Design a protein around this ligand. Structure first.
Ligand SMILES: *[C@@H]1O[C@H](CO)[C@@H](O[C@@H]2O[C@H](CO)[C@@H](O[C@@H]3O[C@H](CO[C@H]4O[C@H](CO)[C@@H](O)[C@H](O[C@H]5O[C@H](CO)[C@@H](O)[C@H](O)[C@@H]5O[C@H]5O[C@H](CO)[C@@H](O)[C@H](O)[C@@H]5O)[C@@H]4O)[C@@H](O)[C@H](O[C@H]4O[C@H](CO)[C@@H](O)[C@H](O)[C@@H]4O[C@H]4O[C@H](CO)[C@@H](O)[C@H](O)[C@@H]4O)[C@@H]3O)[C@H](O)[C@H]2NC(C)=O)[C@H](O)[C@H]1NC(C)=O
Ligand SMILES: CC(=O)N1CCC(c2[nH][nH]c(=O)c2/N=N/c2cc(C(F)(F)F)cc(C(F)(F)F)c2)CC1
Ligand SMILES: [Ca+2]
Ligand SMILES: [Ca+2]
Ligand code: NA
Ligand code: NA
Ligand SMILES: [Zn+2]
Length: 809
């Protein structure tokens, strides 16, 4: 109940929300059906439209007008945005040459430059180039300020998850807005775009920017605008708020536009109808900047122009139907469209089985346009699993496609045709899903291009721009320092928590009873001192190029040196946490020799009690083993024996070994040839609770049968070289280049529908799908990489957030 018979007189777009049943006059009151009776009349004036004309200049104030052209309007803060242009001979902001904003030029009483977030729904990254001729205000922001060629949204690339990620710095699995539609099994409640459940605070986790600001004494404009409030009124409201007395005036504001997304759904991303929405958005930016200029704030405010996601061509004929795959389609609930999420229709149905649903959906049609995954098997870069609102079965849908349960869900009578031509929601690495970032103002750099970055990073920067301490989030604070003229955030590297042991030769061969064998009994002061030096770390400078990784948790581990590689060996997990080696451009690939095929050698530096054993592998009929440093890349026949040490061994399913062996035998050398040497760091990852974070020992669900050897859920590699590829990886003077992956350690290759073919036809495709940031691997391992480089720490933070996408231009 609302007692809608209070009044909005003097309350229009009030910033404090009044509680039920008293009536509201804030920018969201319409959405709640709660506005006072006179809200439209007083707060939503339209009379005479939005622009001054020559005949209106100097008019007697008429309080009925949408905006004012009277002499008093500047001091009232309610002129039409083009007032000084029409009436005082001033220029539009877009027509002024740009001039560097070296310092804030703010009116007296401003404590800090205000921030205005100008958010545009469905603004695909390529609109900035493709629509530049029809967006002159936006193009001036972009060319004069700081811009990225694109900004990566979070998955799913839907509106609510991305807008709340912008506000919080959190992945959707952590903030809880995991789709536009959701069912929470604990609340037994559903969240929908339409309706009232979405206003309940229990959906919305983390701490959004407006709460962070308010807690720290920085006033915030109300971020959300009821759909029916025209954009011109949104802009005039922000400009009016900026004219408030210092003690009342917010420091942070948000504008939102439902375009170009609204039209993009109807017409496709590049439909000829799309030109007009882009023109209209540019006009709104122009109104804002002209309005700021009239208030002498155009060289004071930091403006962020930012989208939530892009837009792809999708039509209803490109729909896959689950009823073409499942016999039991009526026993499931599907959240459909550009991603699929499946759960049981009824919790009382004991015949429901996700294993049989996955199998029925796996590689069933030659050009099948979705792929089913248990959520823990989704690429880790998606960070899309650790929330009870995310169903266990997920369908990753190919770009340009939909999935639906039955054809009747898609068509409507009488004709059966559908009219949409665009959609979004796909994997966040897809080019059509990329969106925009421009920052313009005294705190941003001048005429500066920055590399693409993820929208999870922006919360930290918005906190920096407002002098706020960010709540804990998934950004890497400092990684966007290169966007900023000032207010940079200068973090210190985390402290190493566990220091390594450096064991020497402590055990005799006969102390080991591991059931291993090796034909190595094959027989010099010259060369013997040489081998001893390698074991003491004489080659470590070649193979550990950026320092040893730091271990950020409490554990017991050993550093082990060899001719061709260095490793940090865990006495708790019985395998390396990391193995580091450099392969030059000139390196040669060799085979595993016949006499060494089944060779595993005890490591006399590490006790039998802290070693794996071969008998476990012999007894475990599902599990084989691989090596982290590849024997194929040994520098000499003699050095190759090091690669067969039990301390270089890791558990691997035979199916996974196909992947691994191809990576090690073929792809590493290929990358070294292409990149002028590579440094490789590889290792295991244990994430049995799929929370994106390193498992402790007591979270491990699977061991090599009969043993205490834990089975990794994933294997990673970080592959680093010189950004200037004219310099070899091991003699690089300047910035670095990296690509990494986190491959799922699966006992089958069902994910790869072409896996019966030669590995040259499917393995690299798998690896691209599972591309990763170094930062993802840090979370998953508790290691901190690149500790010793010549580079600035912020530069290294940027490097650690890099994702190699494998998408064309
Ligand atoms: C991305 O960045 C974020 C932010 O930094 C990272 O997320 C953090 O990760 C931490 C570790 O997983 C986690 O810390 C836990 O906090 C628990 C208290 O949590 C509440 O309070 C905080 C603070 O205000 C709040 O943020 C939380 O909000 C979550 O939960 C509500 C639901 O109430 C949601 O609305 C909200 O969206 C958010 O949900 C997300 O996180 C939860 C986990 O907290 C998930 O379950 C959801 O799926 C969703 O992802 C909470 O309201 C605290 O209880 C935990 O402590 C337990 O574990 C420690 C280990 O140190 C142990 O010592 C304790 O004893 C305790 O164990 C006891 O409880 C266990 C569980 O019942 C039980 O098994 C034991 O036997 C014990 O009894 C823990 O410290 C922190 O909450 C989140 N924060 C957020 C905002 O998500 C995230 O990791 C980053 N991602 C990556 C990949 O880096
Ligand atoms: C129909 C639809 O698809 N809907 C429902 C209406 C909703 C909407 N209408 N009017 C608005 O102003 C607005 N959202 N504005 C923001 C802006 C930000 C930002 F400033 F950070 F960018 C964050 C958020 C938050 F949701 F994440 F909280 C919301 C848009 C999604
Ligand atoms: Ca959107
Ligand atoms: Ca974990
Ligand atoms: Na075996
Ligand atoms: Na397969
Ligand atoms: Zn949309």
């Amino acid at each position: 109940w609302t007692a809608t018979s209070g009044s909005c007189k003097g309350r229009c777009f009030e910033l404090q929300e009044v509680g039920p049943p008293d009536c509201r006059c804030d920018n969201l009151c319409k959405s709640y059906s709660s506005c006072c009776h006179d809200f439209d009349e007083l707060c939503l004036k339209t009379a005479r439209g939005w622009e001054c004309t020559k005949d209106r200049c100097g008019e007697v104030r008429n309080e009925e007008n949408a905006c004012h052209c009277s002499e008093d309007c500047l001091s009232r803060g309610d002129c039409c945005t083009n007032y000084q242009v029409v009436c005082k001979g001033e220029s539009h902001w877009v027509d002024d040459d740009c001039e560097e904003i070296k310092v804030p030029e703010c009116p007296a009483g401003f404590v800090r430059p205000p921030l205005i977030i100008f958010s545009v729904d469905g603004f695909r990254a390529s609109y900035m180039k493709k629509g530049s001729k029809v967006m002159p205000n936006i193009e001036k922001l972009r060319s004069c300020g700081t811009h990225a060629p694109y900004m990566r949204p979070v998955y799913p690339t839907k509106t609510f998850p991305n807008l709340y990620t912008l506000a919080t710095g959190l992945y959707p699995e952590s903030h809880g807005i995991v789709g536009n539609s959701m069912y929470d099994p604990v609340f037994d409640a559903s969240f929908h775009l339409r309706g009232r459940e979405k206003f309940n605070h229990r959906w919305w986790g983390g701490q959004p920017l407006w709460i962070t600001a308010t807690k720290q004494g920085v006033r915030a404009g109300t971020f959300f605008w009821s759909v029916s409030i025209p954009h011109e009124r949104r802009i005039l409201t922000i400009l009016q708020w900026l004219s408030l007395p210092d003690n009342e005036r917010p420091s942070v504001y948000a504008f939102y536009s439902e375009q170009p997304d609204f039209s993009g759904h109807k017409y496709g991303p590049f439909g000829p109808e799309m030109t007009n929405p882009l023109r209209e958005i540019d006009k709104t930016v122009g109104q804002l900047m002209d309005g700021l200029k009239q208030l002498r704030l155009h060289r004071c405010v930091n403006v962020i122009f930012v989208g939530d996601h892009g837009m792809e061509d999708v039509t209803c004929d490109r729909t896959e139907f689950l009823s073409n795959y499942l016999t039991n389609v009526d026993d499931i609930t599907l959240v459909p469209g550009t991603l699929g999420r499946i759960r049981a229709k009824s919790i009382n149905n004991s015949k429901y089985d996700p294993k049989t649903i996955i199998a029925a959906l796996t590689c069933k049609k030659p050009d099948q346009h979705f792929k089913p995954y248990m959520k823990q098997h989704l690429p880790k870069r998606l960070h899309y699993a650790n929330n009870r609102r995310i169903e266990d079965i997920h369908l990753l849908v190919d770009r340009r496609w939909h999935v639906a349960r039955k054809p009747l869900d898609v068509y409507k009578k009488p004709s059966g045709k559908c009219f949409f031509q665009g959609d979004h929601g796909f994997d966040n690495k897809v080019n059509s899903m990329q969106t925009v970032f421009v920052g313009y103002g005294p705190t941003f750099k001048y005429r500066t291009k920055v590399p693409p970055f993820e929208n999870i990073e922006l919360y930290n920067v918005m906190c920096d721009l407002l002098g706020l301490k960010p709540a804990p989030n998934n950004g890497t604070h400092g990684s966007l320092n290169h966007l900023l003229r000032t207010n940079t955030f200068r973090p210190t590297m985390p402290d190493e928590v566990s220091r390594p042991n450096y064991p020497g030769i402590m055990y005799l061969q006969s102390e080991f009873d591991l059931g291993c064998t090796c034909d190595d009994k094959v027989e010099n002061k010259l060369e013997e001192l040489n081998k001893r030096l390698h074991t003491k770390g004489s080659t470590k400078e070649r193979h550990l190029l950026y320092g040893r990784p730091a271990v950020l948790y409490r554990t017991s581990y050993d550093i082990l040196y060899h001719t061709d590689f260095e490793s940090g060996y865990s006495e708790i997990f019985l395998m390396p946490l990391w193995t580091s080696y450099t392969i030059s451009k000139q390196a040669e690939v060799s085979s595993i020799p016949e006499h060494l095929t089944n060779c595993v050698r005890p490591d006399v530096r590490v006790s039998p009690g802290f070693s794996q054993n071969c008998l476990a592998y012999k007894n475990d009929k599902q599990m084989s083993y691989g090596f982290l440093f590849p024997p194929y890349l040994s520098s000499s026949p003699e050095a190759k024996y090091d690669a067969f040490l039990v301390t270089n061994m890791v558990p691997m399913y035979p199916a996974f070994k196909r992947v691994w062996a191809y990576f090690q035998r073929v792809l590493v050398k290929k990358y070294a040839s292409e990149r002028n040497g590579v440094n490789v760091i590889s290792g295991p990852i244990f994430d049995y609770n799929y929370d994106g974070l390193r498992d402790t020992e007591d979270e491990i669900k699977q061991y090599v049968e009969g043993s205490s050897i834990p089975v990794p859920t994933h294997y990673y590699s970080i592959i680093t070289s010189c950004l200037d590829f004219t310099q070899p990886a091991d003699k690089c003077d300047g910035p670095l280049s990296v690509s990494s992956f986190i491959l799922p350690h699966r006992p089958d290759n069902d994910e790869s529908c072409n896996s019966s073919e030669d590995e040259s036809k499917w393995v690299e495709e798998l690896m691209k799908m599972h591309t990763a940031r170094v930062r993802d691997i840090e979370h998953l391992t508790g290691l901190d990489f690149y500790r010793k480089t010549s580079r600035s720490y912020s530069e290294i933070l940027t490097l650690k957030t890099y994702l190699h996408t494998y998408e064309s231009e």
